[PDB]
Design a protein around this ligand. Structure first.
Ligand SMILES: CC(=O)N[C@H]1[C@@H](OP(=O)(O)OP(=O)(O)OC[C@H]2O[C@@H](n3ccc(=O)[nH]c3=O)[C@H](O)[C@@H]2O)O[C@H](CO)[C@@H](O)[C@@H]1O[C@H](C)C(=O)N[C@@H](C)C(=O)N[C@H](CCC(=O)O)C(=O)O
Ligand SMILES: [Mg+2]
Length: 504
């Protein structure tokens, strides 16, 4: 996804815009060169690109200048540390800026012709539910017959094409190029996951958001953000009226202390509640249905109810759908127009129910981490049925997560099966042991250890009873099993297979 019809911008114009210094000083050559693309990865440069040589946690892009020059880069944008790495002559103009990353987004939006002013870009932020919400919006938009584009963790979707992505939210130069390509392909609306990383690090800097939405907040990403406050503030970038990143219109789920705080921040948010608080949109008559679905009445700000049906379980997925409906409405798609696409979309690995022919509920979920697991389980237990859950943790990752995670599983599940999720270099048994240490403390559950992930799934399936619910957690859409080798593995495929192998 790169556009193929970008007119350039003179290098000297860019230099002026961002007030950059030249590494070689007073260039005439700069007045001559044209910039037709922007990238911050040397190996991605196409001839005519500006290479942003950035500093980062693990290296400095200026060390890759030689490579960029050889792939055709017309010029380089870096900081004072960058000039130090380059030492003397690079064969192209080197623009120096303190804080390049804080200005990259605008440069990219300049060269790709400000694609986001020619599109309706919807950004969705929050701790959980970003993916699911972007999926519902994109589903509604399709049903109304709009040409939509989706950008998030599972990948990028435009028209007939679907392609993968390194990050929940791409870096500025990629994002701007994607949006430019979408413009060429005649997309008119784009939904996006906007992570708090992306906001903190300037990834969305040159982008006009027509709608910004907030799902919720609970503790996550504290290995990046120095505190919970900082985490909230990063997200606020999208809602504060005076903020450079304020979206044109704000949709904010209450239901959450953090949610309630964001509404106030936005000052004029369209508010959304599935938990019986007054809001512009509310949910009533929430009923579960056969085939693991949910139906409710969504009441718009005019106070008119709409019959919504959705393939996803859980109260918070009702909240996701309300956010979707609020977004869709402000962008000119009514519930009536939207509902055929919501009735039937499945979001990969987010409470994705797998049905290879009846019996009981079988679901795959992304939920790793203590908090995510607690809510997933709670919204799946009904006094009756029986709830089984297979999971494990990743090797060479903070172990602190393992201990209570099994504890959560112990109080809420009826059957808990501990297996291997990406062990890497770490010894598999040491990982499972620590989770099981949590499963001790059990007056309810029944805990097992089956190392082999495949047999674990097999075990829980054969254990079910018509009406029971099985949950494979901790991978969602993400594949493979790392142990050297990446053994093939897709949680959705085995499980569909395990169900396939069940009877004469
Ligand atoms: C911590 C973080 O935000 N990391 C991202 C960031 O890394 P960095 O600044 O530390 O880069 P580092 O390798 O020093 O590289 C230095 C610079 O030299 C450049 N370089 C480097 C090597 C090379 O061969 N050629 C080259 O040009 C790099 O592009 C980079 O500009 O920029 C790199 C290039 O864009 C990304 O690969 C990297 O994403 C890594 C994979 C990552 O794990 N990011 C996570 C933390 C992240 O972004 N997470 C959120 C998800 C949260 C959620 O989904 O809930 C997201 O929005 O994706
Ligand atoms: Mg997150």
């Amino acid at each position: 996804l790169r556009p193929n019809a970008v007119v350039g911008v003179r290098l000297a114009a860019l230099a002026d815009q961002v007030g950059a210094a030249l590494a070689e000083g007073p260039r005439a050559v700069t007045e001559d060169r044209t910039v037709t693309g922007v990238t911050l990865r040397a190996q991605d440069v196409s001839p005519g690109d500006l290479f942003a040589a950035l500093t980062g946690s693990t290296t400095h892009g200026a060390r890759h200048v030689g490579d960029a020059i050889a792939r055709g880069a017309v010029a380089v944008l870096t900081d004072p540390a960058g000039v130090a790495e380059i030492a003397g002559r690079a064969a192209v103009p080197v623009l120096v800026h303190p804080a390049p990353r804080g200005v990259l987004g605008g440069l990219a939006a300049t060269v790709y012709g400000h694609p986001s002013e020619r599109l309706t870009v919807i950004g969705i932020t929050g701790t959980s539910g970003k993916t699911t919400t972007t999926y519902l919006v994109e589903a509604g938009l399709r049903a109304a017959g709009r040409v939509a584009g989706l950008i998030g963790t599972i990948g990028i979707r435009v028209g007939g094409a679907d392609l993968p992505s390194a990050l929940t939210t791409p870096e500025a130069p990629t994002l701007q190029a994607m949006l430019a390509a979408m413009v060429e392909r005649g997309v008119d609306t784009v939904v996006m996951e906007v992570s708090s990383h992306a906001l903190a690090l300037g990834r969305v800097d040159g982008t006009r958001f027509a709608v910004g939405a907030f799902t919720n907040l609970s503790r996550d990403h504290l290995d990046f953000h120095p505190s919970m406050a900082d985490y909230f503030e990063a997200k606020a970038s999208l809602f504060d009226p005076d903020s450079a990143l304020r979206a044109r219109t704000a949709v904010v789920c209450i239901d959450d202390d953090a949610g309630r705080a964001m509404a106030a921040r936005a000052a004029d948010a369209i508010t959304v509640s599935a938990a019986d608080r007054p809001a512009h949109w509310r949910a009533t008559d929430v009923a579960p249905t056969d085939a693991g679905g949910q139906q409710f009445t969504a009441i718009d700000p005019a106070g008119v109810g709409h019959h919504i049906g959705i393939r996803l379980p859980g109260r918070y997925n009702v909240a996701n759908c309300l956010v979707a409906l609020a977004i869709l409405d402000t962008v000119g798609v009514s519930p009536e127009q939207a509902v055929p696409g919501l009735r039937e979309i499945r979001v990969p690995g987010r409470l994705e129910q797998i049905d290879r022919g009846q019996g009981f509920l079988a679901l795959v979920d992304y939920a790793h981490k203590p908090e995510a697991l607690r809510s997933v389980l709670t919204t799946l237990a009904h006094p009756d049925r029986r709830l089984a859950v297979v999971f494990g943790a990743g090797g060479d990752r903070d172990p602190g997560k393992r201990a209570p995670m099994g504890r959560i599983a112990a109080q809420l599940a009826d059957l808990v099966v501990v297996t291997d999720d990406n062990p890497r270099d770490e010894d598999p048994t040491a990982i499972r042991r620590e989770i099981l240490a949590g499963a001790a403390e059990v007056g309810d559950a029944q805990v097992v250890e089956i190392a082999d992930r495949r047999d674990a799934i097999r075990h829980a399936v054969a254990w079910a009873r018509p009406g029971d619910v099985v949950l494979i957690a901790g991978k969602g859409h993400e594949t493979g099993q790392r142990g050297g080798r990446v053994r093939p593995f897709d949680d959705r495929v085995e499980l569909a297979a395990a169900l396939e192998a069940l009877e004469r």
